[PDB]
Amino acid sequence: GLDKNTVHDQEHIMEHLEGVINKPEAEMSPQELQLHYFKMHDYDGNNLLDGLELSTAITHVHKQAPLMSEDELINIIDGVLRDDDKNNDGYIDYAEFAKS
Amino acid sequence: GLDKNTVHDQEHIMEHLEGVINKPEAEMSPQELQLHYFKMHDYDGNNLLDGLELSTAITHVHKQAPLMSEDELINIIDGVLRDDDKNNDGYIDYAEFAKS
Amino acid sequence: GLDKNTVHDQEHIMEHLEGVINKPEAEMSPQELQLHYFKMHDYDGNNLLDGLELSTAITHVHKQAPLMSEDELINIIDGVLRDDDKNNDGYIDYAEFAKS
Amino acid sequence: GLDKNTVHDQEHIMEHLEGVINKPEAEMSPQELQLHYFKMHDYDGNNLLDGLELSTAITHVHKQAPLMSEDELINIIDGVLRDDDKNNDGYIDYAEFAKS
Amino acid sequence: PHRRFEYKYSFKGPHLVQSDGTVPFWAHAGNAIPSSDQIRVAPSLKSQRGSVWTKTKAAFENWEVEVTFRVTGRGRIGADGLAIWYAENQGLEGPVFGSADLWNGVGIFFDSFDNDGKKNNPAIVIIGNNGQIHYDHQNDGASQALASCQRDFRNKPYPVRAKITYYQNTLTVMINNGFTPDKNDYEFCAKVENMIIPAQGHFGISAATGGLADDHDVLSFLTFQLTEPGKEPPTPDKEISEKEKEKYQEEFEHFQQELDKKKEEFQKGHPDLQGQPAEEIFESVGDRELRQVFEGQNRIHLEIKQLNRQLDMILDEQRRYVSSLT
Amino acid sequence: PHRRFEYKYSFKGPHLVQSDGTVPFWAHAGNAIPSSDQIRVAPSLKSQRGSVWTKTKAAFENWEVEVTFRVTGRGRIGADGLAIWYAENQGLEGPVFGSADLWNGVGIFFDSFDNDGKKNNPAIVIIGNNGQIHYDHQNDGASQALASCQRDFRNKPYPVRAKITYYQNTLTVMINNGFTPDKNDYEFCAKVENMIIPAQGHFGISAATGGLADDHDVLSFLTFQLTEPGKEPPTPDKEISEKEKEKYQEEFEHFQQELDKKKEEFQKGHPESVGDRELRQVFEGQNRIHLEIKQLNRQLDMILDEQRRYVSS
Amino acid sequence: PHRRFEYKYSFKGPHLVQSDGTVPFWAHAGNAIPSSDQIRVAPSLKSQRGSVWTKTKAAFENWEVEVTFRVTGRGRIGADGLAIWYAENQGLEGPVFGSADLWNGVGIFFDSFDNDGKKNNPAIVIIGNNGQIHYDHQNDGASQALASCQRDFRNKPYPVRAKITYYQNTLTVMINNGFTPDKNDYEFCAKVENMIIPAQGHFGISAATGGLADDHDVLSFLTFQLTEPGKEPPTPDKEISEKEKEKYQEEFEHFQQELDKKKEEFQKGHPESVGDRELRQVFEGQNRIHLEIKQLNRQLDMILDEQRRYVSS
Amino acid sequence: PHRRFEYKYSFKGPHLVQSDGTVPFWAHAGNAIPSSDQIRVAPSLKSQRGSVWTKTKAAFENWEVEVTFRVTGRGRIGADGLAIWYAENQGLEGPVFGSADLWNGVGIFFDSFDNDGKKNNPAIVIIGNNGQIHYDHQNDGASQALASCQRDFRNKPYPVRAKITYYQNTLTVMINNGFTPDKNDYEFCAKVENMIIPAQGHFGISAATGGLADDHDVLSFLTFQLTEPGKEPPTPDKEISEKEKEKYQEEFEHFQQELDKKKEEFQKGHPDLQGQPAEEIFESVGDRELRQVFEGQNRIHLEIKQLNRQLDMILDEQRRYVSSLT
Ligand SMILES: [Ca+2]
Ligand SMILES: [Ca+2]
Ligand SMILES: [Ca+2]
Ligand SMILES: [Ca+2]
Ligand SMILES: [Ca+2]
Ligand SMILES: [Ca+2]
Ligand SMILES: [Ca+2]
Ligand SMILES: [Ca+2]
Ligand SMILES: [Ca+2]
Ligand SMILES: [Ca+2]
Ligand SMILES: [Ca+2]
Ligand SMILES: [Ca+2]
Ligand SMILES: [Ca+2]
Ligand SMILES: [Ca+2]
Ligand SMILES: [Ca+2]
Ligand SMILES: [Ca+2]
Ligand SMILES: [Zn+2]
Ligand SMILES: [Zn+2]
Ligand SMILES: [Zn+2]
Ligand SMILES: [Zn+2]
Numbered sequence A, B, C, D: 001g002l003d004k005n006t007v008h009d010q011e012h013i014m015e016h017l018e019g020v021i022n023k024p025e026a027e028m029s030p031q032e033l034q035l036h037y038f039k040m041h042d043y044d045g046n047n048l049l050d051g052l053e054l055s056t057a058i059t060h061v062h063k064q065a066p067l068m069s070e071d072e073l074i075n076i077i078d079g080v081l082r083d084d085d086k087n088n089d090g091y092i093d094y095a096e097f098a099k100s
Numbered sequence E, H: 001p002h003r004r005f006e007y008k009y010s011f012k013g014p015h016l017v018q019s020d021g022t023v024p025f026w027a028h029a030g031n032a033i034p035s036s037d038q039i040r041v042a043p044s045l046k047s048q049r050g051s052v053w054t055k056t057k058a059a060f061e062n063w064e065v066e067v068t069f070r071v072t073g074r075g076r077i078g079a080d081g082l083a084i085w086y087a088e089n090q091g092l093e094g095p096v097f098g099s100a101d102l103w104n105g106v107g108i109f110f111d112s113f114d115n116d117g118k119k120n121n122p123a124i125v126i127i128g129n130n131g132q133i134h135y136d137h138q139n140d141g142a143s144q145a146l147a148s149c150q151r152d153f154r155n156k157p158y159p160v161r162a163k164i165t166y167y168q169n170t171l172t173v174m175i176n177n178g179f180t181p182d183k184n185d186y187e188f189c190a191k192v193e194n195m196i197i198p199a200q201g202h203f204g205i206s207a208a209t210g211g212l213a214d215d216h217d218v219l220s221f222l223t224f225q226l227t228e229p230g231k232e233p234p235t236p237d238k239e240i241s242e243k244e245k246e247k248y249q250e251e252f253e254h255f256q257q258e259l260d261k262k263k264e265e266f267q268k269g270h271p272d273l274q275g276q277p278a279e280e281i282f283e284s285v286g287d288r289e290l291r292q293v294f295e296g297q298n299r300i301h302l303e304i305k306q307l308n309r310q311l312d313m314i315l316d317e318q319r320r321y322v323s324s325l326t
Numbered sequence F, G: 001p002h003r004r005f006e007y008k009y010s011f012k013g014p015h016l017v018q019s020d021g022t023v024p025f026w027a028h029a030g031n032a033i034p035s036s037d038q039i040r041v042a043p044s045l046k047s048q049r050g051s052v053w054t055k056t057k058a059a060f061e062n063w064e065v066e067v068t069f070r071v072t073g074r075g076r077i078g079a080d081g082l083a084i085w086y087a088e089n090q091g092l093e094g095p096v097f098g099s100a101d102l103w104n105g106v107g108i109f110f111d112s113f114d115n116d117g118k119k120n121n122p123a124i125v126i127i128g129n130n131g132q133i134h135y136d137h138q139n140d141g142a143s144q145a146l147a148s149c150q151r152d153f154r155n156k157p158y159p160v161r162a163k164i165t166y167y168q169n170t171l172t173v174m175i176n177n178g179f180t181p182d183k184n185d186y187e188f189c190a191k192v193e194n195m196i197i198p199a200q201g202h203f204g205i206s207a208a209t210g211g212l213a214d215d216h217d218v219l220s221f222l223t224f225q226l227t228e229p230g231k232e233p234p235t236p237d238k239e240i241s242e243k244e245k246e247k248y249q250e251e252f253e254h255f256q257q258e259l260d261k262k263k264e265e266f267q268k269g270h271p272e273s274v275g276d277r278e279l280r281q282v283f284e285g286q287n288r289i290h291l292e293i294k295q296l297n298r299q300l301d302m303i304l305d306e307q308r309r310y311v312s313s
Helices: A010-017 A030-040 A051-058 A070-084 B010-017 B030-040 B051-058 B070-084 C010-017 C030-040 C051-058 C070-084 D010-017 D030-040 D051-058 D070-084 E242-267 E285-295 E298-325 F242-269 F276-312 G242-269 G276-312 H242-267 H285-295 H298-325
Strands: E002-012 E026-030 E039-042 E049-054 E063-073 E081-087 E105-111 E123-129 E147-149 E160-167 E170-176 E187-193 E202-208 E214-227 F002-012 F026-030 F039-042 F049-054 F063-073 F081-087 F105-111 F123-129 F147-149 F160-167 F170-176 F187-193 F202-208 F214-227 G002-012 G026-030 G039-042 G049-054 G063-073 G081-087 G105-111 G123-129 G147-149 G160-167 G170-176 G187-193 G202-208 G214-227 H002-005 H026-030 H039-042 H049-054 H063-073 H081-087 H105-111 H123-129 H147-149 H160-167 H170-176 H187-193 H202-208 H214-227
Touching: A010 A030, A030 F242, A051 A070, A051 F002, B010 B030, B030 E242, B051 B070, B051 E002, C010 C030, C030 G242, C051 C070, C051 G002, D010 D030, D030 H242, D051 D070, E002 E049, E026 E039, E039 E049, E039 E202, E063 E081, E081 E160, E081 E214, E105 E160, E123 E170, E123 E187, E147 E170, E147 E187, E202 E214, E285 F276, E285 G276, E298 F276, E298 G276, F039 F202, F063 F081, F081 F160, F081 F214, F105 F160, F123 F170, F123 F187, F147 F170, F147 F187, F160 F214, F202 F214, F276 H285, F276 H298, G039 G202, G063 G081, G081 G160, G081 G214, G105 G160, G123 G170, G123 G187, G147 G170, G147 G187, G160 G214, G202 G214, G276 H285, G276 H298, H026 H039, H039 H049, H039 H202, H063 H081, H081 H160, H081 H214, H105 H160, H123 H170, H123 H187, H147 H170, H147 H187, H202 H214
Parallel strands: none
Antiparallel strands: E002 E214, E026 E049, E039 E214, E049 E202, E063 E160, E063 E214, E081 E105, E081 E202, E105 E123, E123 E147, E160 E170, E170 E187, F002 F214, F026 F049, F039 F049, F039 F214, F049 F202, F063 F160, F063 F214, F081 F105, F081 F202, F105 F123, F123 F147, F160 F170, F170 F187, G002 G214, G026 G049, G039 G049, G039 G214, G049 G202, G063 G160, G063 G214, G081 G105, G081 G202, G105 G123, G123 G147, G160 G170, G170 G187, H002 H214, H026 H049, H039 H214, H049 H202, H063 H160, H063 H214, H081 H105, H081 H202, H105 H123, H123 H147, H160 H170, H170 H187
């Protein structure tokens, strides 16, 4: 549920960047790949993550496994919004995302 | 399977003719009743019944009952075509229909 | 050159009216067919004949013959404009055309 | 009719090459002169002269003189094709052109 | 030749589906939506694949297939398109117009998207296959095209009709392009001579949608078995007589005319019935764009009217102020 | 007011549906086809009825929903049409625009077919319901219409946008008619003052198809909880210092510029149309003319009030 | 002023050419193709030059010509272009827009190709000539241009109309750019004051084609002699009585109505398109918007002068 | 097969016409305008008929004809269209695409107007005739159509190329529709098998214009005589040797590369040369209409700017009047 290790993963963002980006780097900074993760999952194009974008970021199939229940996803997203969001806008900004 | 009592039924064609023609008069002649039965079930216009029109004429959705199986329906229509159709055109004409 | 007999011609206006009008009349008044002649040769659609429209009305081939010289046409049209036109607009109106 | 003196003429191809290439140097080699003659008259690009390109190469519009008749032109081109063309393709190649 | 209507390999409205929501004698898979009047083989969403195949195998050496369909799009480009198959096995799902590749039979592809880039599509392509030859999806099957026929079958006012006739080892495809309500207006499209197809196979229809989106509806599918012109047993013993025929067809006609007369006075007897036009359910894509452009100008007219009213109000106010000063 | 985006009562693309074939936090019933980029509530077949409702109920007194939709038809007449519901319970099936009759709440109807015959369709009709009344289907609910509007939302070049705001017991419906791709281009359509609705209810959408047939696609649905500026409670001592925020954001912007450079260099490293661009330019020019005339109207209002104040002296 | 239509210096359809293949009272030279409904002065072939001039010379001091033309090209660049000449003698051949250089008179040039490179083409250039000067072909005559204008007259939906008026030693050029089918819709383009031209001359038109190629069609050419209202001489005692004129005209109108009835009855007795009608409606709506904004401008000018007069008190 | 270029039955640019204004070895009649680069067989005026025919008769049993043409119109409908003939006599003038009726030979008609009303044109129709059969002008020759091929050849960015091959009594028509600058991109259009044509006849091209108007230009016309694949006399005695061939082709290549190098430094030596683009001389009819609609909106913008300037002026005048009062 948006763990520090899940965000700080060098290969998940590399797998996302395939096709759109043809630049396989050797090794990147944890903050660099975290910024890449933040930019990748903002589908709407507004630099403002919300609950739906986080739900897409957490429960996408990749490449078999049982999907997570809706209650667990609701609890995880509610916890993320409660902990990280501070302006109570319903959106997660990178200023609010910098904590984790 | 296209029984003599089935075509000679006033209530069935009275239910069909409701709405389209608002003339319930009295008991109808058997030949007139058979002519109405033949004309009401030809959903296209060719004065020619076939297998699909007969299948619609057998498995009604009238106001419950289990649907007829495919094998029994196939056997019924094949028997009707074998007995009534004589020119081997695949259609049943009123001259072919009047035999049974 | 726009003679009284040339304007008062039933068969010429009948030949013009073929195809556009399918109403062959038996006999028409001279003023009636003269109005038909005036309405036929106003190609521009303004109820105002000019020199060019009269030139078309005089030297059209119909159904072989040597075409009239430009000097003779100039003289005829200048004479018509001098005699019939009174407002000096350069156009021949039916008010000005009623003299001949 | 494609004479040896005609292809071996400096003034003709000097007139042609004016404008396109601004390099009048000196007297040119006969083989270079013949190569320029062959290349300048192929208005398409195929390295292949034919009857129409030869007809243009014979009846110039240079700066008077009466135009050549059709029969003499036909005879000249037919003679050139009969003598020079050997593969019977209808075209004259540089290998076929170098014989005469 | 002589044609016999084979009902077991055919479907047709206006009662296409039963109470179970399935087409009788047919099996549908994918994103196909069978309705009571048509089968929407692939709807207008992204990446839709649909197929409807015969449950039983056909055993006619000479056959005729009449297909009535519509391919309707909001734009000027289709997405993948339609396919009519006579295979030996049911493809179900796959990359070839919503059906599996490497088929053993004949397949008539109605391609509406030009994958190769020659701007020759939409087109009808007749392709035969033996089982091991693949289909080049990105080249519109141009190398394998036995017979291509450049026909535009999208966004037509009337349903497009196709007649595929396999007779004497000749496959003739004749297409009514759907400009007239007349059913029997088949113009020639393509022909393949001396083609060998499997002796028994399944009929099928399939459709697919790609990046763009089209609605691929099939209104009817009629299968006729064709017999040889001379190798037909007459068998006149089953026929009774011409006297009974003469006693029957005229009373049939009398019933028809009497029913018409008995229906006419009650058609106008209840005037609550309402009708709809026919031209209003057709508009070309360019005509629709121009009508949208014209529709977008009403806002400008309304705002100019508001401006004129406000300017008139301020003019009258200025005049009344001048009058008040005097 | 202040808007908080509620994810539990919202859906949008481009990942609208998951692998299970169900919209997250929503339940669809009928002929609705939830796709990955839109929900086709009722397709262009005959007699189609579809509904998509929230699984859970709402718990806010002032709210706002932004709905993006398309109604595309083969002809110039339409089906029954769309409806956006704030009800008390999930109907999920019924004869009122694909949803149940006798509801308790508000329903905004987008009617495309003129049953009454007054030539006032397509239209937007706000209908409230206390729980016991039948919707007049054959008269477009003209008798029960709390308010009404008249906009054409079919076959537009761009998606039609609707904003429905329940604030201070007033319901406001503002519609971007779909001639411009701008998201915030709403124009006033209808308003109902002093309307009471249940304090908790289900948000839903539904669509129905009749003799004719339109495709009723829903591209997005976003629900915002609205709180009053006076009622907004401040929660300080939780945010980080503004200097740290600026230090983060400057390198965020620098790294997004670097990302754009990388994207461009490896889009060019690794290998619209005429007429469509011309049509887009035509519509942009029409929008520019409309905006300039609106500015002229604002300037005329300014000079009008200036002249009124001068006269008042 | 008062206008008298001179037929000797005019041509128009739909019977422009006679059976002899020559335009009456006009002489054509070059690649001009006089057809029955227009004159193609220079077709869309490479290096085409055409001219059509009057056979006789004009004998009026104040005049006016209305020229209807189309310049249609396969591409977005144009040929050399059109020219309307009032000269002293028929050039009929030459390198200046298909007509002779070193002319004595006025020439209105419709240039479609920018030889100078200032991106100021297509344009309308009025050039006078006393008899001895060379037209700067490679600079569009910018040095010799008495006046200039800048209108696009190529590939318009409707024919482009031009009105050139020589009145009181002033030459005025007004152009209907061709977005409306109205004949009298001219907009001001250029004006030259105090210009002297020969008292008698030839009226001509010409067109030339260069590396690219446009079709230069002339649909009509009407020449009006203009006389001053003060100089207009009255000639009474020649007209018939006004009562007789009314008696004639009432039955003229009655008989033309009867003719319309007969035409309709035997058009129905004896037996445009979608998109084209839609485009016509689009252009009509654009013209309506333009006319309404022009009316608003007139009203704003009215209130401006009213406020100025109020301030002057 | 082996193909020989017959110059006497061909014409090409960029010197198509001589100083006399006539096409060599060809005779043109009607409204045909031969230019130095193309022959405008029928210009874009009303009721134009044009023909260009071979002066001499051809005597090839197996031949190939390559025709490059453009048919360009200001609208979306053509007028009458084009025709390529191999007759026995010169038609000159007549009602069949600008040429006489009742011809004895083959005629490939490029019809751009749908006279019959089935909305199947533009189309290519192969029609043979023996001398007594007329041509139905008002039915597009549908009854006499030996082979029809629905191809749109109007308003294309590149010239349309047609290859008509009469070989072994088979007439194959293959058409490059003119979307690419590549010359050798011929796609299949139609084929007639076992057709008898006169043993010797005149080649010809003709075009006609009706109520509407198209420009019918022919840029080139190439005639090739085809010999049998095996019945070709080799005659190797006239060939000298491969040694002279090797001594010639490499000095030809050396001359070509030396000329390129000697031309490159003076191509940039004089920078006064100017060029033109290629896409700018193509625009679709609908795209042109939309661009005209967009062009018509500039007047509204200019008038709104004038209105805004005048309203600002009156606002400043009102403010200065208020200041003057105070
Ligand atoms: Ca976001
Ligand atoms: Ca936030
Ligand atoms: Ca039937
Ligand atoms: Ca039968
Ligand atoms: Ca007139
Ligand atoms: Ca007069
Ligand atoms: Ca060559
Ligand atoms: Ca050779
Ligand atoms: Ca394809
Ligand atoms: Ca293709
Ligand atoms: Ca309704
Ligand atoms: Ca209504
Ligand atoms: Ca110029
Ligand atoms: Ca310039
Ligand atoms: Ca035709
Ligand atoms: Ca036709
Ligand atoms: Zn991932
Ligand atoms: Zn029943
Ligand atoms: Zn006459
Ligand atoms: Zn030379």
